[PDB]
Amino acid sequence: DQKNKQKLQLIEELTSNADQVQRQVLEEILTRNADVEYLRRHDLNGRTDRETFKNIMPVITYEDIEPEINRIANGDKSPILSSKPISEFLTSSGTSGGERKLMPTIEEELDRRSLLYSLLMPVMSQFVPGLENGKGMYFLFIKSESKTPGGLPARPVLTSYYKSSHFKERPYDPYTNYTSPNETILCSDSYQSMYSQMLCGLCQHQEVLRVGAVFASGFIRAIKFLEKHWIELVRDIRTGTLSSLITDPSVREAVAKILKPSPKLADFVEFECKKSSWQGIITRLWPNTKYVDVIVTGTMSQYIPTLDYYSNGLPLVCTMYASSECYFGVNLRPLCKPSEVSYTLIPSMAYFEFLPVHRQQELVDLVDVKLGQEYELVVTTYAGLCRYRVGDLLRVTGFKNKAPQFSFICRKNVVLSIDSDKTDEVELQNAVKNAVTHLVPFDASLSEYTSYADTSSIPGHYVLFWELCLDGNTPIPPSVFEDCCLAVEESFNTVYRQGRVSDKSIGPLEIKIVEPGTFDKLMDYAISLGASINQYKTPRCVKFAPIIELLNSRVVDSYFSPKCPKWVPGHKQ
């Protein structure tokens, strides 16, 4: 019987009693945090009931509780948001004033993250058999850490999770037996982390029954890493000796238990990697792979054709929906189509509310959301976030017993995204305005521009299309356009700049100069589909393949900066 059946029954119990669980969660939070400064400031006066909470407590954004956050981050240890000690800040990919948002968490929250993860394979065991008889090849990575002036860790939620006893000291689980040893995941050197993970995956290739990464982008980068380094990898496999470039002793102690001299495997890997076409290479190097486990909902959907290419059309699986401030839900139907993914929110994670979005107690509870209606996700967490707006838009597609299921629509205001980076229109506009100052000495200027997330390169990069207006009589040298590139990048927020400098999840920004009349063609094309002259601006971003092919066909010159933007871990202040 055991675990799977119990976990599946737990899902039944939680979703059949969703409203009661939601109530018990809110009651527990307000009872614990009854005396914290934030609740007392709003005069909640020790009350714990739903009606009081919804009538009294305001619906907030990050900027609303930043003074509380800063105070805690500066070392104020009084109960301001939470009665249990804030153990760390989980730095979100979402920003504020260019800097990562600091999400308070408490130690207890790891239990709830682990509960969520423990649901995944029992759910999957209903759709794909035999996964306990083999391994999963996942490429998992830690990121830069930082510390608040008061001494609290500030780091991404997965970096926090991987380094915790819940992952680093976890027991052997046959349904989640990874090819990557903990030492290779927890390696601070990102090159060594990637190389050793790729090697271990190759060494255990016949046992691999599934592959992936947290994000589509992450898995694509691992494939590209093999494209560049397979010769070194084949040499390691052939001789049974790990590359001396791997200097980390914990790494390589771990590899040494896995790596054995095997010219037969080396010949096999060489054979496949030598081939000019890498179409379907996943199903050749790892022939027992049943699916690809990566997020391809949200902006990550742009990577579907790339994964399909390398996998020869294996099923793409989206298992979960979660964030820094709170873990949310699970896909109860993982082998569905990527366009039909819905996430069932787990009612014991947090108190969930929903702000209706239309094309006086305003909020609607989890069980009262309406089929087909769009909402903004609003959360009340154990660490003291009260009715915080996530910025995620969701649509109800159905119900699991009493618990609703949501397709993910978007994170609000995201224009450009390659990996976890999110660039909005204001950021983009500001960035382009800082870069055009470089065209002033040449008495040139920008007439019009647009952008796209270029996925043809690994890692992806931002592309800007620039149509200039030249009034002077001196050509602009490549060095100045390269200055323009860098200037754009320097104006982007810290997550973008971290992706460029530290995580290598983003390639150099490219500016493509297009010939005169190019954006005229765009408009003409934009009217043949969708034809509103009155309401027409050249869009800040484009995404439709024929439009992009049109713009690329009219490129006169392109430029990247050889330089990287500034980046320093932690908040500016």
Ligand SMILES: Nc1ncnc2c1ncn2[C@@H]1O[C@H](COP(=O)(O)O)[C@@H](O)[C@H]1O
């Ligand atoms: N499965 C998913 N599909 C689409 N977007 C997601 C998914 N999981 C997380 N996200 C987005 O990433 C955010 C979490 O980012 P972070 O706070 O940095 O972990 C969420 O609030 C969503 O906007």
Ligand SMILES: O=C(O)Cc1c[nH]c2ccccc12
């Ligand atoms: O930065 C990280 O690695 C944590 C993270 C960022 N976006 C996420 C979405 C799903 C679960 C974890 C994360």
